[PDB]
């Protein structure tokens with residue numbers, strides 16, 4: 001039995017990594033992710049300059065997941081670039097760098113600088129991604145960034161959107177992975193006890209993660225798995241167990257990202273997840289992920 | 300203490316009703332809903348002619364809700380029109396008729412005929428609703444339908460869409476209520492044991508209801524509550540308890556629709572929900588819904 005994944009000219013010990021933004025902002029966090037049992041890691045979605053992010057509380061753990069409006073608190077692009085360039089032990093595992101410029105211009109400028117580090121060190125861009133704005137952003141990055149990269153996608157909720165998004169993504173051969181999904185946007189958690197919202201920014205509206213989002217994540221993983229056969233899908237959303245991960249891979253996921261569960265449990269979770277996924281595969285008589293990836297049975 | 304709701308020239312004993320499509324397709328179900336403790340009921344979203352709907356299994360109950368791709372199985376407009384015109388006991392409770400024409404023309408033609416029955420009997424249209432198409436549809440319906448009505452909305456996931464949707468709806472004074480929300484569209488449930496999807500239509504993709512959707516429902520209820528101050532909001536999504544309903548009302552809901560929970564429990568649920576909401580209100584020292592409707596506290 002093996003959880004090994006081979007993709008993007010890299011070998012991964014297992015499909016697991018953090019979801020961008022979860023436990024990957026500080027040096028300590030990046031180190032902890034590198035030292036963890038995870039197959040990879042992704043750095044916090046960065047902007048050109050450090051960002052304080054939104055006022056607190058801006059994250060709330062919930063019985064069925066989480067809600068957040070972090071507001072991109074990050075150490076800035078130079079920080080994550082320097083980690084990728086000078087600090088990350090690529091001997092331990094490959095590194096993804098998540099980028100979330102606040103404009104096309106910002107992404108272009110960061111990508112221009114990232115190019116050299118990707119070339120020299122092998123850091124892989126996960127570009128945090130209105131289909132016109134999407135086409136423009138990808139066009140700009142593809143134009144200036146001389147490497148394959150991946151895109152972190154918001155969830156879509158109908159086939160028309162799955163088709164529209166896939167059509168655009170398929171126009172960009174440099175997009176070699178698609179990460180499905182980011183949060184289900186702008187949920188509103190209300191605490192019955194306090195008769196209030198639970199996060200401060202944006203009147204309590206924030207992205208949902210965790211158990212809430214698993215079927216949506218699976219839908220999106222599978223939708224793009226089907227519609228972008230030339231591309232890899234990374235799953236993200238609602239993974240708390242090896243069984244959840246199994247579902248992601250069955251839907252078509254190559255890598256499996258862990259946000260909310262990781263936020264609650266810390267990087268030790270990856271030891272548990274590898275163990276559980278191996279346990280699931282053992283019970284189901286699977287030896288490799290290739291044996292069932294994308295093989296979800298329809299009726 | 301009173302769960303009384305007053306809206307659209309009607310008095311409702313309590314805010315509870317079935318969600319359209321749940322236990323409201325047949326004469327039997329409609330009578331059962333009328334005989335229930337619910338404040339109201341809505342008939343299955345109708346098309347001009349009967350529809351068989353999608354191949355089964357097309358609904359699956361889940362730990363955290365439900366997934367369905369029913370495909371609008373319904374007895375056709377004439378059937379629901381006849382129920383409203385000739386059968387429904389308005390002395391028991393008001394009646395909503397859900398309409399879901401597969402084209403604007405179909406809606407227009409059904410509304411032309413519904414007009415007389417709305418006038419004569421007081422049945423209230425809930426029109427099951429692309430913002431261009433939306434405005435166009437509402438214009439066409441408003442043209443031929445000389446009555447107040449409401450619209451059943453899909454969930455939106457950002458403020459851009461809340462704003463755009465609200466702007467359109469606010470163009471139409473006849474739209475006196477907005478029902479938030481229809482299902483979170485096209486989730487994909489995978490059974491880990493069978494390594495398959497759980498519904499047959501559309502490769503297993505289907506609308507999510509129940510616990511999955513509550514924060515999204517609350518977000519939409521509140522978003523439209525804020526943006527459409529001239530209208531009422533009907534809450535729909537993730538109501539299992541009086542406390543969930545409390546949350547709907549706190550977010551801005553006038554009426555509270557129950558889908559998945561009602562599917563699983565049957566119409567006796569309304570007796571439990573009315574009792575539970577009164578229990579919540581008693582603990583919280585509320586006597587009427589007016590006292591906390593829309594009063595969710597932000598930070």
Ligand SMILES: Cc1cc2nc3c(=O)[nH]c(=O)nc-3n(C[C@H](O)[C@H](O)[C@H](O)COP(=O)(O)O)c2cc1C
Nearest residue numbers: 019020021045181182183209210237238258259260
């Ligand atoms: C604390 C918090 C911060 C996040 N920051 C980012 C971010 O920087 N960039 C990004 O693409 N996604 C970010 N996400 C979204 C996650 O990467 C992930 O898409 C989402 O949480 C769904 O996964 P989950 O169900 O495992 O939480 C963040 C999520 C949370 C909970």
Ligand SMILES: Cc1cc2nc3c(=O)[nH]c(=O)nc-3n(C[C@H](O)[C@H](O)[C@H](O)COP(=O)(O)O)c2cc1C
Nearest residue numbers: 318319320344480481482508509536537557558559
């Ligand atoms: C079995 C099934 C059939 C449904 N049929 C309709 C329909 O006819 N028209 C409609 O507007 N919504 C329909 N819905 C969506 C519900 O009205 C409701 O918006 C959704 O289920 C969310 O509410 P819930 O969490 O209480 O289930 C249906 C939902 C289910 C579960």
Ligand SMILES: O=C(O)c1cc(=O)[nH]c(=O)[nH]1
Nearest residue numbers: 069070071072073183207
């Ligand atoms: O930084 C954040 O607040 C954030 C970014 C993102 O892409 N997704 C999310 O849920 N939060």
Ligand SMILES: O=C(O)c1cc(=O)[nH]c(=O)[nH]1
Nearest residue numbers: 368369370371372482506
């Ligand atoms: O009939 C259906 O399939 C259906 C209609 C609708 O509006 N919502 C839903 O979840 N299902």
